[PDB]
């Protein structure tokens, strides 16, 4: 009759903002960068025993570092910037955002290969197989500690989801290639599958952000339809860059902000840029032989308190080094 405490963890929109530095003022910033997101992982982290941390994608593209990186292109072996920060940061998995495809797939092949931690989507299919491009999901075996300190492992699962918008976002360079699958549709077939493997939580990472439509296959916003389908634990999303719970979704049936669930499944999703992060809460008891959630809480902590115009999260010193040399050709590449 074991009791375990579970924290997930998830960046998300990050659109290689990797310093908190604004090339086009050519000026620091407290108000994005993983440079300070960072802290609030190390402090999320400090707070618990069990804990895991994803990324939702749109990561290599949307800031100076990635139109730098675009232009000077990668060649096999070469370590994204991205990931030269990511990689020391132990994600357990990282998802496809929309913009990972902008600069086409061999770059993206190319970007994904430097990080140090696996990817997944679950839609995406290659054109000429029928088989998912990508690794759809993951089930990972994790080390957690109870209520009394007696140690499982943890077989956490991990799916992920692009919006299927990307075959006219990105028609020239997928148009022939690939095709995508309807996310809810996917989701509700893996999850039976994962479940069946041996999966005790699985954890949906959506780059999709959230509607109160009716459903209809090819959404682009599918979070709502997500969060009732049958064995999702916590849903990590993204893409809407906007902030989940908040005010933004009080009028959606069955959002609870206060708790940040929706439809009684924790739900998070942490803005854009870094200037969030997503931590969902979730309590395990096996005593009914499987794991099951018990409670759940999700919240977003910011970077920085808008109201009272002061950080809330320090710039990481050791990533700054890190990155050092990318931040100057990123100042180089602007001023060219
Ligand atoms: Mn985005
Ligand atoms: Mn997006």
Known sequence: ????????????????????????????????????????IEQARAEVKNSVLVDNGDVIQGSPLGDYMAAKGLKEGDVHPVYKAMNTLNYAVGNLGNHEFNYGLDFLHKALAGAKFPYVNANIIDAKTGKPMFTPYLIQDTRVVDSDGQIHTLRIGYIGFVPPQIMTWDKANLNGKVTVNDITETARKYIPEMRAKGADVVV????????????????????????????????????????????????????????????????????????????????????????????????????????????????????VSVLKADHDATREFVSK
């Open 1 to 40: 009759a074991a009791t375990v405490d579970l924290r997930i963890m998830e960046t998300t929109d990050l659109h290689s903002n990797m310093m908190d530095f604004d090339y086009y003022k050519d000026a620091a910033t407290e108000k994005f960068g993983l440079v300070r997101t960072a802290s609030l």
């Open 204 to 319: 949906v990472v959506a780059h999709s952000g959230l509607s109160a439509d009716p459903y209809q296959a090819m959404a682009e916003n599918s979070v709502y339809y997500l969060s009732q389908v049958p064995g999702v634990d916590a849903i990590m999303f993204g893409h809407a860059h906007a902030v989940f719970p908040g005010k933004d979704f009080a009028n959606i049936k069955g959002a609870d902000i206060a708790k940040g669930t929706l439809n009684g499944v924790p739900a998070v999703m942490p803005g854009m840029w870094g200037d969030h992060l997503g931590v969902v809460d979730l309590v395990l008891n096996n005593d009914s032989g499987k794991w099951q959630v018990t409670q759940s809480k999700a919240e977003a902590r910011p970077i920085y308190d808008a109201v009272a115009k002061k950080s809330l999260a320090a710039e990481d010193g050791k990533l």
